[PDB]
Symmetry: D3
Subunit: 155 residues, 6 copies
Amino acid sequence: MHVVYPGSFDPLTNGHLDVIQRASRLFEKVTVAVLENQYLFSAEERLAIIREATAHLANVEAATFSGLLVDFVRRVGAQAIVKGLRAVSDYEYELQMAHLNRQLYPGLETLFILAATRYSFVSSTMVKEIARYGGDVSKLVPPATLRALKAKLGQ
Amino acid sequence: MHVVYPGSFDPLTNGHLDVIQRASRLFEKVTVAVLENQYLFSAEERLAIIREATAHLANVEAATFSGLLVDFVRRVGAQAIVKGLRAVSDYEYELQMAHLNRQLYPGLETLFILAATRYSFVSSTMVKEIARYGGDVSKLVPPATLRALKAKLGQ
Amino acid sequence: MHVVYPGSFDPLTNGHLDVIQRASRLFEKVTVAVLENQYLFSAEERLAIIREATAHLANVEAATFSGLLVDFVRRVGAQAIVKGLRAVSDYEYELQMAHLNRQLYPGLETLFILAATRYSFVSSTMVKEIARYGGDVSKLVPPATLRALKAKLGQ
Amino acid sequence: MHVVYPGSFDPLTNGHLDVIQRASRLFEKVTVAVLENQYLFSAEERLAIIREATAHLANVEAATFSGLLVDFVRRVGAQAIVKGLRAVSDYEYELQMAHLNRQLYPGLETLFILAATRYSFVSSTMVKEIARYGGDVSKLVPPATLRALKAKLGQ
Amino acid sequence: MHVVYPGSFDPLTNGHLDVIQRASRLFEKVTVAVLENQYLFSAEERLAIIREATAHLANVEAATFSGLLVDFVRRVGAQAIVKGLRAVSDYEYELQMAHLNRQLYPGLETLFILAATRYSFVSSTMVKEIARYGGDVSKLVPPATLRALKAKLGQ
Amino acid sequence: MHVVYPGSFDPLTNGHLDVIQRASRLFEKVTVAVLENQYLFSAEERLAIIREATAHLANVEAATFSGLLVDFVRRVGAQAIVKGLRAVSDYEYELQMAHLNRQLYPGLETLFILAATRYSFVSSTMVKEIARYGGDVSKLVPPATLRALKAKLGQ
Ligand SMILES: CC(C)(COP(=O)(O)O)[C@@H](O)C(=O)NCCC(=O)NCCS
Ligand SMILES: CC(C)(COP(=O)(O)O)[C@@H](O)C(=O)NCCC(=O)NCCS
Ligand SMILES: CC(C)(COP(=O)(O)O)[C@@H](O)C(=O)NCCC(=O)NCCS
Ligand SMILES: CC(C)(COP(=O)(O)O)[C@@H](O)C(=O)NCCC(=O)NCCS
Ligand SMILES: CC(C)(COP(=O)(O)O)[C@@H](O)C(=O)NCCC(=O)NCCS
Ligand SMILES: CC(C)(COP(=O)(O)O)[C@@H](O)C(=O)NCCC(=O)NCCS
């Protein structure tokens, strides 16, 4: 089974990486789909961070996409969408998108994986807010992201 | 009983229409109140969509309003506000507005109606996002809205 | 419009009474349906409490019922079910019953009314627990209920 | 991938069957695990209902189990647990079990699938309550379950 | 114990004041931290409102801050953060910040206090929206805020 | 400040202990109140587990109580109730009790502390269920509890 893990990943956090690692162990192939269209990092920068952070996972690929997610899924020939859930995640929103995507692409399923408990409260938005003020986010994001934040924010 | 169903309806979805149809069957009179003040459709366009989509309901009228909803309710002489609820709807926000409106207009009640299960995950925001990228939203919105989206987005 | 407000009301609390009073002001007729089948009070005792507590509302009647609520609704010729909502109420459960009842009795709607903010945290279960240990529940329940609790618990 | 779908299924509803059908299409093998230990139906009766209702799915097997679910998963050599989610489901409880099971069986993942919107409000408990009073549950459960309910309740 | 109650307080509502009053009675010292960085009121105006509204509480001080809240907490030598909770409050968001702050400032706890039931549905955003259209918010905010709103909105 | 941490603690889990440890560091005195009245462990056994597990905390005492919690609080002369919150905890129920207790004991506050993220999904009920079937709960409960479970369940 080939699954697609979509998101803006601005930037990639340990929560995202944890879900990617779990999907990597479960499925034959995982494609991380990076949304491209105000993000802190460009689509290219976000993709580069992901390629560096997932280099150790042999069955994980990554690419940017524009337009409808279901069209990307069809384009890469995947069987399902995978998303991570956190005790904090917007349950309603994920359910809504999952149902809508299953209508746009008749029968396309979204499978939810539970992110590691230790990263239950990590979000890209909070990482950026903390980093912006010089806060230490080293335990919340992978090394590739930490380096990118320091370069971007000039810290 | 005369009830008012308020909203921005940008644009009207099948979820909204379903609630309007239920209110039409329950109450003697229903007035759909269209908020006017960045919306995709102008207040006039949103009102026109509603008039076309509800033409089959003899006791349903529609009008735009600015300012406080409670002042519009008093203006048209309605007895209550009616709102639709979805297993996804922002329960907290609706409860908050209902309580505040009951204070602004002493004793003015808001009655909640459950939208059809089949439209539980439809929202104007998602309809616009999907339509913007050429996605098929024909099963999510009434014909009047579908026509308006194609003309607006030039599709 | 004739509406039915169902419940076990074991015993009737100020939250229940508040909703009954709001329904009384909104609708032409309100019938409080008392479920009869381990309750602290018998169906007869629960009905008596309700008749005493709602005596001041001219358009409110009360009766016990067994079996399906929808059959009682049809029996008394009501147009809808009314239920109260609290920021604490089991939103999911009420939504579930509302949808199921709308299927059992094709098109039968349930209208939700918001209970007074001051009684947002009152429930029959907590009233009984507090009263059982001699706690003062006088501000949480109507006089009829207070008298019944003192007699039942021998306080 | 071989997945296990656990539950008490007392009795199997259309919500359960829908999830089983989705899992059947996604995974190579699906084993429905029936909990055996006050249920309305015996473990044998519940298993029989499932075997009849899933007969059309070639890659779906079913069996009863006692003790820890993770031990059953290991016993049948499955790679993950699959559970269905409904906009009403006890999100917290499912998350809790998923995390605990991932600890008991190091790394064992639970994948969540979204049940069909039309069965979002169906639960075994409500089916039994409605059927007990002669209510029509034919649209809420599969034929095998309908027959079992009529025989059990003598209707 | 010295606690810090942070927020934007744009403007201070009765919900905020209620929590401040409760914290004042519980702890030896309370410092209200006003976030400074599009707010309706300037940081100076927001601080002035708070100083006027809390003048009756002898152990309550107030100051503006920029950057990380944890740095302000350390700066004033406080032992914990205190936040108010409402049956409507974004539980998830408060939990997220509490956990993140406990990581940034190793072991720094956030203590949650329940706001008065009567102000359970009051928020700065809704106060501003209502006041903007000439609605009466006198029962939702303290006198200092009412005066500031009339001057700011020229009402 | 002297605070009371109430519960049935049947048995004490790492989630409970974590909250007790946090309260111990924050407040001058902490009294763990053990509810006594079908529990797996007797009130005496539950209290013994707590005394052993909290022996390292010099300002923590423990005692059993019957009747109303507010009466126990008054009896020991405490200033507030402290409770732990988990992203899974029944938010509504805790809010309800906090409000009711603040009415029974005019002004008695309940302060909520966030349990460690790592124990976010641990509950006494699940510990007992897992232990009953021979599951390893050593990482979910303190040594005192592990020993008590083995003796009670004869494992
Ligand atoms: C990128 C994402 C998966 C959400 O990512 P996020 O959780 O990082 O904000 C979603 O916005 C998306 O799928 N966008 C592509 C447009 C689309 O397909 N929209 C219809 C969704 S039903
Ligand atoms: C239009 C609406 C009903 C919300 O509509 P929405 O759900 O489509 O966003 C609400 O914004 C409104 O009532 N606006 C008028 C201003 C007002 O009365 N505000 C006070 C609300 S308590
Ligand atoms: C009595 C009540 C309204 C719930 O009352 P409660 O909130 O006081 O517990 C509900 O149990 C009911 O309607 N019972 C009658 C049986 C029935 O119709 N069941 C199907 C519900 S979909
Ligand atoms: C049967 C079920 C999946 C829950 O089923 P339900 O949703 O039908 O009530 C759960 O109770 C279970 O896994 N029971 C076996 C005992 C066990 O493994 N318990 C630990 C759960 S973390
Ligand atoms: C001001 C506030 C407490 C939130 O206030 P609000 O609820 O009024 O919007 C929060 O934004 C904050 O602490 N800001 C300072 C920046 C910071 O410390 N961010 C990290 C939060 S984990
Ligand atoms: C023991 C407890 C704190 C709840 O404990 P739990 O979360 O372990 O189930 C609660 O049941 C309690 O306070 N019981 C004493 C009786 C009482 O005071 N009841 C009124 C509560 S408002």
